[PDB]
Amino acid sequence: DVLAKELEDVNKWGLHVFRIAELSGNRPLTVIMHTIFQERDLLKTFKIPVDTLITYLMTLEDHYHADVAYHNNIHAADVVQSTHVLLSTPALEAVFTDLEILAAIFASAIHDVDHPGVSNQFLINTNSELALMYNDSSVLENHHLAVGFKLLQEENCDIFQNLTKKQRQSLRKMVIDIVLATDMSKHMNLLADLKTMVETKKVTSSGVLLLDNYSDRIQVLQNMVHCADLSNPTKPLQLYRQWTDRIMEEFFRQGDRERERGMEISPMCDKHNASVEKSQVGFIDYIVHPLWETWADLVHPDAQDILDTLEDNREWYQSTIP
Ligand SMILES: Oc1ccc2cc(-c3ccc(OC(F)F)c(OCC4CC4)c3)oc2c1
Ligand SMILES: [Mg+2]
Ligand SMILES: [Zn+2]
């Protein structure tokens, strides 16, 4: 009842995702996904057996690393739930089909699975087997996808077993397109394209965004999930700070490995020369605010409160440097 009371916040920005993780027994991804599938009536729409959903969700959640500080199952649940809220924005009402909503939510859930807690560049610089498999190109993101789809083949895990062949083919392509777009080295090109759409966007008679081709539809979903991925500084401050604690631990541990190996330490990864507050300020100024401002423009004014929180959080971190 405690957990179930907290899951009543699932449509709200600033869900207490860390309390849900603890209240659910380190199962935040399973219970948040299950709740959202129920809320959106997805189990009935796609004839998904409830037992099949739980088995897949638990296996998926199992393949997130419980000893990685940031890129774990809690981050995955957070991104799912954030994507779920952004799908419900008034400017997008009745825009996406049930299959596109399914794809966006599923993509979010798998988008970092089996993440080892080090970056693509580190996997490239260390001659890793992952970088060798994927020829240095979206190494992690290709991997998260391969794992997320492969697990559907485990015993009683195919949650898509009752989709038509065409629905599965279309869903598979959309999920790939969405997850490869969370490759952080693609952020500038993705944002540049988003700006273009905002400059040239159209609305319908009802006031809703007009997306009449696959290219525009997938581009909005790509940016939606990328926004959810980069949504930590838009959250109430107590949530944001704990996300920063976790990312910096993960970054520090990567820099300790780059130290033990004689490599140049990556930006912000050296725990003997790291200004956490200044870096959060530059993170918001150069990455998170330019993206969220553009998204807010696309769906104006639906996202105004999310943007105000980001600007408050920016002011707060700034205020701690003088
Ligand atoms: O190659 C990649 C791929 C994915 C991610 C995700 C992030 C990321 C997420 C949250 C962050 O801060 C706070 F919001 F928790 C953050 O800031 C740390 C940086 C020094 C200023 C970075 O950084 C990444 C780098
Ligand atoms: Mg990622
Ligand atoms: Zn992520």
Residue numbers in the entry: 90 to 411
Please give me the paper's original passages concerning this structure.
Phosphodiesterase‐4 (PDE4) is a member of the phosphodiesterase family and is involved in important physiological regulatory functions through the hydrolysis of cAMP. 41 There are four subtypes of PDE4: PDE4A, PDE4B, PDE4C, and PDE4D. PDE4 plays an important role in the hydrolysis of cAMP, its inhibition of PDE4 leads to an increase in intracellular cAMP levels. We further found cAMP‐specific 3′,5′‐cyclic phosphodiesterase 4D (PDE4D) as an essential therapeutic target for liver metastases of CRC and interfering the function of PDE4D could repress colorectal cancer metastases.
Based on these previous studies, we designed and synthesised a new series of 2‐arylbenzofurans as potent PDE4 inhibitors. The most potent inhibitor, L11, exhibited a potent affinity of 54 nM, which was better than that of other compounds. Given the potent inhibition of L11, the cocrystal structure of PDE4 with bound L11 was obtained at 2.1 Å resolution. The liganded PDE4 crystals had the space group P212121 with unit cell dimensions of a = 58.36, b = 80.43 and c = 164.58 Å, and the structure was refined to R/R free = .227/.278. The 2Fo–Fc electron density unambiguously revealed the binding of L11 to the PDE4 pocket. The scaffold of L11 formed two H‐bonds with the conserved Gln369 and π−π stacking interactions with a hydrophobic clamp consisting of Phe372 and Phe340/Ile336. In addition, the 6‐hydroxybenzofuran fragment of L11 formed an H‐bond with residue Asn209, mediated by a water molecule, which differs from the binding pattern of roflumilast. Further structural superposition of the crystal structures of PDE4‐Roflumilast and PDE4‐L11 also revealed that L11 has a slightly different binding pattern. L11 did not induce emetic effects in dogs at this dose, indicating that L11 is well‐tolerated in dogs.
